[PDB]
């Protein structure tokens, strides 16, 4: 149900993650109080920082090009990140911190496409590694 898609095509790396609102902020309704409003703002703030969620090796020299965040109010969040990496061969793996910022997420269904090489894996808070 949290779904992460990763596609690497030359220097272009696309990461896209779709998550129900309960997986992101803890609730799917409109904030009821200041705590919930701050939780939503903090969550949206983190989603605009893909480098906190999906650390790319500095040796890959990945530049952020586009960030798209959609919130549909069940409610869900989609974050779509586009990087251009100068040294994409230096991108060996990603260690996601998704669960550190969004501990309500139990598991991620991940799909990885590196050129034409397709693989899937299920991540959890203790198994956050993705091979690229």
Residue numbers in the entry: 39 to 111, 123, 185 to 242
Paper text:
We were able to crystallize Δ124-184 ZrgA but only in the absence of zinc. Six protein molecules occupy the asymmetric unit, although the protein is purified exclusively as a monomer as determined by size exclusion chromatography. The N-terminal residues from Asp 22, the first after the predicted signal sequence cleavage site, to Gly 39 could not be modeled into any chain due to a lack of electron density. The same is true of residues 113–123 comprising the first part of the flexible loop, except for chain D where only residues 116–120 are missing. These regions are also absent in the apo PA4063 structure, indicating a high degree of flexibility and disorder. A disulfide bond is present between Cys 100 and Cys 195 in ZrgA that is conserved in PA4063 and other homologues. The tertiary structures of ZrgA and PA4063 are very similar with overall rmsd ~ 1.2 Å2 between backbone atoms. The beta-sandwich structures are virtually superimposable, although the long alpha helix is angled away from the central beta sheet by a few degrees in ZrgA relative to PA4063. The crystal structure of apo Δ124-184 ZrgA was nearly identical to PA4063, including the observation of unstructured regions at the N-terminus and His-rich loop.
